């Protein structure tokens, strides 16, 4: 009978395990996503400073 | 009745870790159950709550020391009759302090 | 309170045609909702959202606006919430609809929060939080002002109301997850609302949620600097004694680490740490360190906090700090007073500047109106003799001997007790 | 019925407690990563923009 | 402190995270007191502020239970005496009343 409770707990814990593995893996994946997004910022900076540099010219 | 012995049976309990202490304290207040040991495979001093028993032993040691000082001295000790259940909250550490 | 009504609403389907035939909604709206209900598989749902996306949020809004009986409106709201759970990206359809309508997303939904049904209003709130946290379009200006004002009013109710405040705090947290809403909430008096509801003995889950919020604020350096105007730590330290649960204990430990980490200045770290130590967090951290827990965060945070609190204790034990508290009259049990190692290292420092420290102590022994200051002066005078043998004659010269042996008859038992301790120090030997 | 129903419903509440605790831990890491990788990107972009500013 | 020592012994006797985060206990109890046992657990939840419930499970047991005889002041000495040669088995005939 107690194996019933133990089974249900182990199954809920498997669910927790996969959910929390995704939670952790999100850090690893979004680090790369940020490594990508840096391009947006740097290119925008370059274009802006190009505009004001043209003004100076 | 006394005609023959008791009809005892086995059981078990699930409860959240935090509530375990308070609930088993209420079972101590009740007094109609006997607990097993689910980890005889390793010593009791190597379970989840080693330090907790270590400090209770040491605190009782110190209380025995002060009681011995009391007996050496002339002050009595109060047998007030109150026998409360020990608080589960971390007021434990206040009692320690 | 949320779950049972959500489950009932998932099943309380009724004919959407009842209102089209009454001319309260449009034929395309009714057709969209009926087709979407029939199209249940994930691919079919995506096909509907991608073929009639412009009609989707319009159907939702029209029915929610014009419907009297809640069951259908709750059905739409629960469907949107469950669809966001299935795929968080579903916030995008609302933004597509709003952009096609040449409008921001908020005026469509914010009025719903003023409707009558607590379930429906709070589900609208959850939907708004998801939408404006995930989407590119943040909430801003008067719109965010009213939204957080509604959050504040729902908090002001402070039980089914508390279980709805669970959703209120959940929305608040899902929003604070993004930085802008954090500064908005600190600009508002909402942090005072958190303080008020916490002090008003709200329920365990709600405690975890608001400590989650303060932990989010502490994550940010400037928000951490802001929140000192409330000083949660005196409340949290003692409430930790009751909240032994892993959830709350973990989150408070994390908030403590965040305070001491993201404090902007050395003085900010000293303020937070002083609050901690004078409210006795260090002994609790030692006890928790003796304790062991499920996951990394609790124990790693306890270890970090022990490191930082120890560093703060050493700083307060600095000889310069001792002299400065003597000059500033702060003889109020700073860790320097009870740190025995400091006394062993620096008892000779009380001879510096021709015993000016002892002179301050012995002048305070007849100038201190505060019994705390008087007692600490007597105790420190005794500790000086304990830690520096030649100080016996120095104290006899300065009158600390007589002053403490008299003040053991001072009108305050605390001063009497400390003076007896000091005289015992003097009489440690010949 | 009552015995099985009680055991099942209470252990379902216990499963729900477990899964909500796991969700809270997952949310904790969710927020901490939000802090960390975003300030990492802040530092990287700050260096990139400083290089661009020196060039300009 | 002595009650505390007893309770910490009791909790160290429980199964641990390797089984599950929530603590598990194993107990001997008479069939007449199951309701009171669960009620004691309920009071404990009330005090601890545990909204998640305690649960008590039976299990058909091949193992031998302890023995009890509902002693009273008058009969205690007689029960002690008859058990001194050996503690009776599960609800077997008790010699005390006739002795």
Swiss-Prot record, chain D:
Tissue expression remark: Expressed in brain (at protein level).
Superkingdom of the source species: Eukaryota
Sites bearing Phosphotyrosine, chain numbering: 55
Modified residue annotations for N-acetylalanine: 1
Positions of disulphide bridges: none
Cellular compartment(s): Apical cell membrane; Cytoplasmic vesicle, Secretory vesicle, Synaptic vesicle membrane; Cytoplasmic vesicle, Clathrin-coated vesicle membrane
Family as reported in the entry's similarity comment: Belongs to the V-ATPase E subunit family.
Role played: Subunit of the V1 complex of vacuolar(H+)-ATPase (V-ATPase), a multisubunit enzyme composed of a peripheral complex (V1) that hydrolyzes ATP and a membrane integral complex (V0) that translocates protons. V-ATPase is responsible for acidifying and maintaining the pH of intracellular compartments and in some cell types, is targeted to the plasma membrane, where it is responsible for acidifying the extracellular environment.
Subunit field text: V-ATPase is a heteromultimeric enzyme made up of two complexes: the ATP-hydrolytic V1 complex and the proton translocation V0 complex. The V1 complex consists of three catalytic AB heterodimers that form a heterohexamer, three peripheral stalks each consisting of EG heterodimers, one central rotor including subunits D and F, and the regulatory subunits C and H. The proton translocation complex V0 consists of the proton transport subunit a, a ring of proteolipid subunits c9c'', rotary subunit d, subunits e and f, and the accessory subunits ATP6AP1/Ac45 and ATP6AP2/PRR.
Descriptive protein name: V-type proton ATPase subunit E 1
Taxonomy of the source species: Eukaryota, Metazoa, Chordata, Craniata, Vertebrata
Recorded name of the encoding gene: Atp6v1e1
UniProtKB/Swiss-Prot annotation, chain E:
Residue numbers carrying Phosphotyrosine: 68
Residues annotated with Phosphothreonine modification: 64
Top-level taxon: Eukaryota
Coiled-coil region: none
Compartments (UniProt record): Cytoplasmic vesicle, Clathrin-coated vesicle membrane; Cytoplasmic vesicle, Secretory vesicle, Synaptic vesicle membrane; Melanosome
Subunit annotation: V-ATPase is a heteromultimeric enzyme made up of two complexes: the ATP-hydrolytic V1 complex and the proton translocation V0 complex. The V1 complex consists of three catalytic AB heterodimers that form a heterohexamer, three peripheral stalks each consisting of EG heterodimers, one central rotor including subunits D and F, and the regulatory subunits C and H. The proton translocation complex V0 consists of the proton transport subunit a, a ring of proteolipid subunits c9c'', rotary subunit d, subunits e and f, and the accessory subunits ATP6AP1/Ac45 and ATP6AP2/PRR. Interacts with SPAAR.
Described purpose of this protein according to its UniProt entry: Subunit of the V0 complex of vacuolar(H+)-ATPase (V-ATPase), a multisubunit enzyme composed of a peripheral complex (V1) that hydrolyzes ATP and a membrane integral complex (V0) that translocates protons. V-ATPase is responsible for the acidification of various organelles, such as lysosomes, endosomes, the trans-Golgi network, and secretory granules, including synaptic vesicles. In certain cell types, can be exported to the plasma membrane, where it is involved in the acidification of the extracellular environment. Required for assembly and activity of the vacuolar ATPase.
Family: Belongs to the V-ATPase 116 kDa subunit family.
Protein name in UniProt: V-type proton ATPase 116 kDa subunit a 1
Species in which this protein is naturally found: Rattus norvegicus
Classification lineage: Eukaryota, Metazoa, Chordata, Craniata, Vertebrata
Gene (name only): Atp6v0a1
Residues included from the entire protein: 297 to 395 of 838
């Amino acid at each position: 009978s107690q194996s019933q409770g133990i089974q249900q707990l182990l199954q809920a814990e498997k669910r927790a395990a996969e959910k929390v593995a995704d939670a952790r893996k999100r850090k690893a994946r979004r680090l790369k996503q940020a490594k990508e997004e840096a391009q947006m910022e740097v290119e925008q900076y370059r274009r802006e400073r190009e505009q004001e540099f043209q003004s100076k010219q | 009745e006394l005609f023959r012995s008791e009809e005892m049976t086995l059981a078990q309990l699930f409860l959240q870790s935090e509530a375990a202490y308070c609930c088993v304290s209420e079972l101590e207040e009740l007094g109609k159950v006997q607990f097993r040991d689910l980890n005889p495979d390793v010593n009791v001093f190597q379970r989840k709550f080693v330090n907790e028993v270590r400090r209770c032993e040491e605190m009782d040691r110190k209380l025995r020391f002060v009681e011995k000082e009391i007996r050496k001295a002339n002050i009595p000790i109060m047998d007030t009759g109150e026998n409360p259940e020990v608080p589960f909250p971390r007021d434990m550490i206040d009692l320690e302090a | 309170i949320i779950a049972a009504k959500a489950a009932e609403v998932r099943a309380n389907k009724v004919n959407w045609q009842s209102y089209l035939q009454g001319q309260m909604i449009s034929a395309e709206d009714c057709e969209f909702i009926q087709r979407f209900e029939m199209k249940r598989c994930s691919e079919e749902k995506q096909e509907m959202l991608q073929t009639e996306g412009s009609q989707c949020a319009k159907t939702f809004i029209n029915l929610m606006t014009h419907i009297s009986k809640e069951q259908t409106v709750q059905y739409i709201l629960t469907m949107v919430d469950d669809m966001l759970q299935e795929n968080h990206q579903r916030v995008s359809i609302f933004f597509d609809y709003a952009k096609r309508s040449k409008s921001t997303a908020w005026p469509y939904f914010l009025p719903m929060l003023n409707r009558q049904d607590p379930f429906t209003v709070h589900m609208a709130a959850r939907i708004i939080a998801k939408l404006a946290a995930w989407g590119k379009e943040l909430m801003e200006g008067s719109d965010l002002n009213y939204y957080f004002n509604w959050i504040k009013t729902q908090l002001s109710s402070q039980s089914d109301s508390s279980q709805y405040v669970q959703c209120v705090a959940g929305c608040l947290q899902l929003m604070l997850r993004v930085n802008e809403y954090r500064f908005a909430w600190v600009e508002a008096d909402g942090v005072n609302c958190i303080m008020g509801v916490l002090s008003n003995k709200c329920g365990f889950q709600l405690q975890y949620q608001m400590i989650f919020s303060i932990w989010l604020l502490a994550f940010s350096p400037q928000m951490c600097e802001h929140l000192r105007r409330y000083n949660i730590i005196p409340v949290l330290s003692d409430i930790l004694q009751e909240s032994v649960k892993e959830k709350v204990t973990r989150i408070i430990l994390a908030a403590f680490r965040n305070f001491l980490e993201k404090s902007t200045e050395r003085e900010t770290r000293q303020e937070y740490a002083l609050a901690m130590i004078q409210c006795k967090v260090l002994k609790q951290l030692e006890n928790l360190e003796q304790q062991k827990y499920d996951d990394e965060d609790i124990s790693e945070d306890i270890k970090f906090l022990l490191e930082k609190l120890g560093e703060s204790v050493q700083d307060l034990s600095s000889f310069d700090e001792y002299s400065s508290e003597l000059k500033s009259g702060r003889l109020e049990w700073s860790p320097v007073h009870k740190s025995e190692k400091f006394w062993r290292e620096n008892a000779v420092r009380l001879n510096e500047k021709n015993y000016e420290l002892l002179k301050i102590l012995t002048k305070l022994l007849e100038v201190s109106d505060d019994p705390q200051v008087l007692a600490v002066a007597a105790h420190d005078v005794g500790e000086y003799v304990r830690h520096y043998p030649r100080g016996k004659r120095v104290i006899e010269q300065l009158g600390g001997k007589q002053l403490v042996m008299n003040h053991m008859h001072h009108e305050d038992q605390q001063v009497r007790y400390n003076a007896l301790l000091a005289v015992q120090k003097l009489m440690v030997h010949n | 019925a009552l015995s099985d129903a009680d055991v099942q419903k209470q252990i379902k509440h216990m499963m729900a407690f477990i899964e909500q605790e796991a969700n809270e831990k997952a949310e904790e890491i969710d927020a901490k990563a939000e802090e960390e990788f975003n300030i990492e990107k802040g530092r990287l972009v700050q260096t990139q923009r400083l290089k661009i500013m020196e060039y300009y | 402190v002595r009650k505390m020592k007893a309770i910490y012994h009791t909790l160290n006797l429980c199964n641990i995270d390797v089984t599950q985060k929530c603590l598990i206990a194993e107990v001997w109890c008479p069939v007449t007191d199951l309701d009171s046992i669960q009620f004691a657990l309920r009071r404990g939840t009330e005090h601890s502020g545990s909204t998640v419930p305690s649960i008590l499970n039976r299990m058909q047991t091949n193992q031998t239970p302890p023995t009890y005889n509902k002693t009273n002041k008058f009969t205690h000495g007689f029960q002690n005496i008859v058990d001194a040669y050996g503690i009776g088995t599960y609800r077997e005939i008790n010699p005390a009343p006739y002795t």
